Ligand binder design. Structure first.
Ligand code: HEM
Ligand SMILES: CC(=O)Nc1cc2cccnc2c2ncccc12
Length: 106
């Protein structure tokens, strides 16, 4: 899966989470998100393809997934404890991570 594919997975699954009723779908979606985030972490985006791997832009980019992955884990712990509404608020919060990265690198 390339970067676009992983982004679609992140987006589709975030929509499942916000619309859901139940812990099962929230857990499942978060789990798919986690996978997609770890996969995207290895990618170099179009805007950065001419930078060096240890340019601040590139380290910034990786840092944003590392945050996202941590946030997904936090929501997933919540969902595992049956705090569906709380897990769901956690998912909404981490849109900031999506949006702040897109603002620079999309
Ligand atoms: C859960 C959070 C996120 C969601 C919902 C999300 C959603 C999406 C979507 C719908 C697109 C368009 C994909 C396409 O062209 O078909 C996209 C593109 C992109 N996203 Fe995200 N994203 C998220 C997190 C991130 C993060 C954290 C970053 C950077 C750390 C990021 C970097 C990018 C890049 C660089 C593009 C453009 C990729 C390209 O055109 O090849 N995204 N994202
Ligand atoms: C500071 C940082 O996270 N650098 C990196 C950031 C990266 C971001 C996306 C793709 N690869 C890298 C990378 N690859 C090899 C060595 C370092 C990096």
């Amino acid at each position: 899966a390339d970067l676009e594919d992983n982004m679609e997975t992140l987006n589709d699954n975030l929509k499942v989470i916000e619309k859901a009723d139940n812990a099962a779908q929230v857990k499942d979606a978060l789990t798919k998100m986690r996978a997609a985030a770890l996969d995207a972490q290895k990618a170099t985006p179009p805007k950065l393809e001419d930078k060096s791997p240890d340019s601040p832009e590139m380290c910034d980019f990786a840092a944003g997934f590392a945050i996202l992955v941590g946030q997904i884990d936090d929501a997933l712990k919540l969902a595992n404890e049956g705090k569906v509404k709380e897990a769901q608020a956690a998912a909404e919060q981490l849109k900031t991570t999506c949006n702040a990265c897109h603002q620079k690198y999309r």
